[PDB]
DNA sequence: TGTCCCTTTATCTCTCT
RNA sequence: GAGAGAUAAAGGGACA
C-alpha cells in the first residue's frame, strides 16, 4: 500500500524510461499485484530480464511482476527459461504464461521437473503441459495430473483430453480430485454421462459445481419441472455452483411475478455469471418492460450472454440518449446488447457513433451491424483505426470494412488484412476482393493465416489445387474448410 | 510481512447453422 | 441464432 507506491515513486522515474518505458498504468499495476518486492525486484533486475538470453518485453515482465510473488517468478524466469527453451523446446512465450499468475516460480519448476513425465509417459504434447500449467495453482495440477491421469481414463474411461481440460482451470487438483470422488456416484444414481460430467468439471470452480449437482439435481429435476440436461447446462460454466443455487432460489419468483418461463429461466443461467444476471433480471426487469417499453422477451435475450448483469444495467442507463440523441431504435439497443460484452459494446457505440457518421460517413445501421456481435467494442475500435489505413493502402472501400468487422473477431479478421493482404496480393496475385471474400465470414483470421500457410508452404494435399480454387474453399468453409481436404 | 492456492464474473474469438 | 473455446480481472482462503 504505502511502501508500495514509496518504492514506486523512488524508482518511476528509471524505469519509465531505458529499458522497460513502463507507462504508469504498468507502474501502479506491480505495485498494487506484485507488492513492494516486484516494484523492487523490477528495477533491479531491469537489465538482466530485458537482454540476452531472455529478451522479454516490458509487457511481459509487467505481466509477471502484477501478481503475488512476482518477484520469485521473475527470479525463477530468469535462472530457468534458457533450460525450458533449450532442453524442453517450449517457446518464451509459453515461459512467460507459465510464470503470469500466482505461484509461478512453482508452475515454472514443476513443468521443468514433470514435463518429461507428462509427455514421455502419459503421452501428452507440451502444448498440453503448458496449458495445465498456465494457471494459479499450476504445481498442484500438472502433480494431480501426473496422479490421476492413469486411473481417470483406465477405469472411468475418460480420454487424456477430458482430463486435460479439467486440469486446465484454477483448482485443477480439486477439480479432478472431485471427478475421482463423484463421477460413478453422479452417473450411476442420478443418470449422468462422463460426458455431462467432465463438462460441469472443465470450468474453473468445478469440484464446486460437481458437489453442487449431486446435492441439488433430485430437487431441481423432482420438484422445479426442469431435466437434467438443463441442470447440466446451468452448471457446464463457472460459477456453475452459483447459477444453480440461484435457479433453485430464483425459479419460482421469476416465473410466477414476472411472467417467464422455466425455459427463459434456464437460458438466463446458462452463462458465466449467470447468477449475477437472474438476479439483475428480477431486480431489472420491471423498470425495463415499463419506464422504457421492453418486452420481457427483450430482457430476457439481453441477459441470456456472458456477463448478461452487465449489459441490462447498461441498457437502462443508455436506452434514452441512445434512443433519442443518436436516433436509434430499441430494437437496435436491444441487438447491439445482446452479445457477450454487450456492455462494452453499447457504450463504444455511444463514443463512436458520431465519429464514424460524421467523420467515415458510415450510416448509423452499419455501426449497429458492426457492434451487433460478440467483441462488438472491439470491432468498433479497429473500423475506426483501420479504416483509413485500409482505404488508402490497398483501396478498401468502406463498404468491404464493414463486411469484415461485422462477424465475431472482426477486430482479428481487420488487422489479419492489414498486416496479409500486401503478401496475398503481391507475392501470390490474389486480389483485394478475394482476401476480402475470405475475411468476410468468422474465421477471418485464421482462414487468412490458413491461405498463407499453405501458400507458402504448400502441403501435397493442397497444391492439387489453383490458388483461385483455394480461395473458393477459404471462401466456402475457412479454416476448417481447408483442413479437412488436406485430410484426404 | 510475503507467497501460494481456490472460486466467480466479464469480455473476446471461432465454428456451425 | 446457437454452441464451443480462450484470455483477463476481481474476490476469497491458507500458511507462516
Given at each position: 500500500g504505502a511502501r508500495a507506491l514509496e518504492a514506486l515513486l523512488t524508482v518511476a522515474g528509471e524505469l519509465r524510461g531505458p529499458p522497460l518505458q513502463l507507462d504508469t498504468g504498468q507502474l501502479l499495476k506491480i505495485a498494487k499485484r506484485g507488492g513492494v518486492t516486484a516494484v523492487e525486484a523490477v528495477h533491479a533486475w531491469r537489465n538482466a530480464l530485458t537482454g540476452a538470453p531472455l529478451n522479454l518485453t516490458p509487457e511481459q515482465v509487467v505481466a509477471i511482476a502484477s501478481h503475488d510473488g512476482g518477484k520469485q517468478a521473475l527470479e525463477t524466469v530468469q535462472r530457468l527459461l534458457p533450460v525450458l527453451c533449450?532442453?524442453?523446446?517450449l517457446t518464451p512465450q509459453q515461459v512467460v504464461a507459465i510464470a503470469s499468475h500466482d505461484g509461478g516460480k512453482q508452475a515454472l519448476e514443476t513443468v521443468q521437473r514433470?514435463?518429461?513425465?507428462?509427455?514421455?509417459?502419459?503421452?501428452?504434447?507440451?502444448?498440453?503441459?503448458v496449458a495445465i500449467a498456465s494457471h494459479d495453482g499450476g504445481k498442484q495440477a500438472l502433480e494431480?495430473?501426473?496422479?490421476?491421469?492413469?486411473?481417470?481414463?483406465?477405469?472411468?474411461?475418460?480420454?487424456?483430453?477430458?482430463?486435460?481440460?479439467?486440469?486446465s482451470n484454477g483448482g485443477g487438483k480439486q477439480?479432478?480430485?472431485?471427478?475421482?470422488?463423484?463421477?460413478?456416484?453422479?452417473?450411476?444414481?442420478?443418470?449422468?454421462?462422463?460426458?455431462?460430467?467432465?463438462?460441469?468439471?472443465?470450468?474453473g470452480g468445478?469440484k464446486q459445481?460437481?458437489?453442487?449437482?449431486?446435492?441439488?439435481?433430485?430437487?431441481?429435476?423432482?420438484?422445479?419441472?426442469?431435466?437434467?440436461?438443463?441442470?447440466?447446462?446451468?452448471?457446464?460454466?463457472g460459477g456453475?455452483?452459483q447459477?444453480?443455487?440461484?435457479?433453485?432460489?430464483?425459479?419460482?419468483?421469476?416465473?410466477?411475478?414476472?411472467?417467464?418461463?422455466?425455459?427463459?429461466?434456464?437460458?438466463?443461467?446458462?452463462?458465466i455469471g449467470?447468477?449475477q444476471?437472474?438476479?439483475?433480471?428480477?431486480?431489472?426487469?420491471?423498470?425495463?418492460?415499463?419506464?422504457?417499453?421492453?418486452?420481457?422477451?427483450?430482457?430476457?435475450?439481453?441477459?441470456?450472454?456472458?456477463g448478461?448483469?452487465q449489459?441490462?444495467?447498461?441498457?437502462?442507463?443508455?436506452?434514452?440518449?441512445?434512443?433519442?440523441?443518436?436516433?436509434?431504435?430499441?430494437?437496435?439497443?436491444?441487438?447491439?446488447?445482446?452479445?457477450?460484452?454487450?456492455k462494452q459494446?453499447?457504450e463504444?457505440?455511444?463514443?463512436?457513433?458520431?465519429?464514424?457518421?460524421?467523420?467515415?460517413?458510415?450510416?448509423?445501421?452499419?455501426?449497429?451491424?458492426?457492434?451487433?456481435?460478440?467483441?462488438?467494442?472491439?470491432?468498433?475500435?479497429?473500423?475506426?483505426?483501420?479504416?483509413?489505413?485500409?482505404?488508402?493502402?490497398?483501396?478498401?472501400?468502406?463498404?468491404?470494412?464493414?463486411?469484415?468487422?461485422?462477424?465475431?473477431?472482426?477486430?482479428?479478421?481487420?488487422?489479419?488484412?492489414?498486416?496479409?493482404?500486401?503478401?496475398?496480393?503481391?507475392?501470390?496475385?490474389?486480389?483485394?476482393?478475394?482476401?476480402?471474400?475470405?475475411?468476410?465470414?468468422?474465421?477471418?483470421?485464421?482462414?487468412?493465416?490458413?491461405?498463407?500457410?499453405?501458400?507458402?508452404?504448400?502441403?501435397?494435399?493442397?497444391?492439387?489445387?489453383?490458388?483461385?480454387?483455394?480461395?473458393?474453399?477459404?471462401?466456402?468453409?475457412?479454416?476448417?474448410?481447408?483442413?479437412?481436404?488436406?485430410?484426404?
Amino acid at each position: 500500500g504505502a511502501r508500495a507506491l514509496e518504492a514506486l515513486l523512488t524508482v518511476a522515474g528509471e524505469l519509465r524510461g531505458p529499458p522497460l518505458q513502463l507507462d504508469t498504468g504498468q507502474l501502479l499495476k506491480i505495485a498494487k499485484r506484485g507488492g513492494v518486492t516486484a516494484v523492487e525486484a523490477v528495477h533491479a533486475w531491469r537489465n538482466a530480464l530485458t537482454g540476452a538470453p531472455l529478451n522479454l518485453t516490458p509487457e511481459q515482465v509487467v505481466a509477471i511482476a502484477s501478481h503475488d510473488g512476482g518477484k520469485q517468478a521473475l527470479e525463477t524466469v530468469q535462472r530457468l527459461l534458457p533450460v525450458l527453451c533449450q532442453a524442453h523446446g517450449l517457446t518464451p512465450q509459453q515461459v512467460v504464461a507459465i510464470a503470469s499468475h500466482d505461484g509461478g516460480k512453482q508452475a515454472l519448476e514443476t513443468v521443468q521437473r514433470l514435463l518429461p513425465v507428462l509427455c514421455q509417459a502419459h503421452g501428452l504434447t507440451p502444448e498440453q503441459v503448458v496449458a495445465i500449467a498456465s494457471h494459479d495453482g499450476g504445481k498442484q495440477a500438472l502433480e494431480t495430473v501426473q496422479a490421476l491421469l492413469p486411473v481417470l481414463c483406465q477405469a472411468h474411461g475418460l480420454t487424456p483430453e477430458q482430463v486435460v481440460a479439467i486440469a486446465s482451470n484454477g483448482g485443477g487438483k480439486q477439480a479432478l480430485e472431485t471427478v475421482q470422488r463423484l463421477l460413478p456416484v453422479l452417473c450411476q444414481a442420478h443418470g449422468l454421462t462422463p460426458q455431462q460430467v467432465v463438462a460441469i468439471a472443465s470450468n474453473g470452480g468445478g469440484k464446486q459445481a460437481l458437489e453442487t449437482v449431486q446435492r441439488l439435481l433430485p430437487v431441481l429435476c423432482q420438484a422445479h419441472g426442469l431435466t437434467p440436461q438443463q441442470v447440466v447446462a446451468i452448471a457446464s460454466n463457472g460459477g456453475g455452483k452459483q447459477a444453480l443455487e440461484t435457479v433453485q432460489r430464483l425459479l419460482p419468483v421469476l416465473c410466477q411475478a414476472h411472467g417467464l418461463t422455466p425455459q427463459q429461466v434456464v437460458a438466463i443461467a446458462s452463462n458465466i455469471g449467470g447468477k449475477q444476471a437472474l438476479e439483475t433480471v428480477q431486480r431489472l426487469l420491471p423498470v425495463l418492460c415499463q419506464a422504457h417499453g421492453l418486452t420481457p422477451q427483450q430482457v430476457v435475450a439481453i441477459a441470456s450472454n456472458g456477463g448478461g448483469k452487465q449489459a441490462l444495467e447498461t441498457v437502462q442507463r443508455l436506452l434514452p440518449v441512445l434512443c433519442q440523441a443518436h436516433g436509434l431504435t430499441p430494437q437496435q439497443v436491444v441487438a447491439i446488447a445482446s452479445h457477450d460484452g454487450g456492455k462494452q459494446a453499447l457504450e463504444t457505440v455511444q463514443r463512436l457513433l458520431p465519429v464514424l457518421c460524421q467523420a467515415h460517413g458510415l450510416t448509423p445501421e452499419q455501426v449497429v451491424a458492426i457492434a451487433s456481435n460478440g467483441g462488438g467494442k472491439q470491432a468498433l475500435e479497429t473500423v475506426q483505426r483501420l479504416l483509413p489505413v485500409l482505404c488508402q493502402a490497398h483501396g478498401l472501400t468502406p463498404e468491404q470494412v464493414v463486411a469484415i468487422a461485422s462477424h465475431d473477431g472482426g477486430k482479428q479478421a481487420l488487422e489479419t488484412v492489414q498486416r496479409l493482404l500486401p503478401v496475398l496480393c503481391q507475392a501470390h496475385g490474389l486480389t483485394p476482393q478475394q482476401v476480402v471474400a475470405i475475411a468476410s465470414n468468422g474465421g477471418g483470421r485464421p482462414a487468412l493465416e490458413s491461405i498463407v500457410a499453405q501458400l507458402s508452404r504448400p502441403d501435397p494435399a493442397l497444391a492439387a489445387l489453383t490458388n483461385d480454387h483455394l480461395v473458393a474453399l477459404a471462401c466456402l468453409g475457412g479454416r476448417p474448410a481447408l483442413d479437412a481436404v488436406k485430410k484426404l
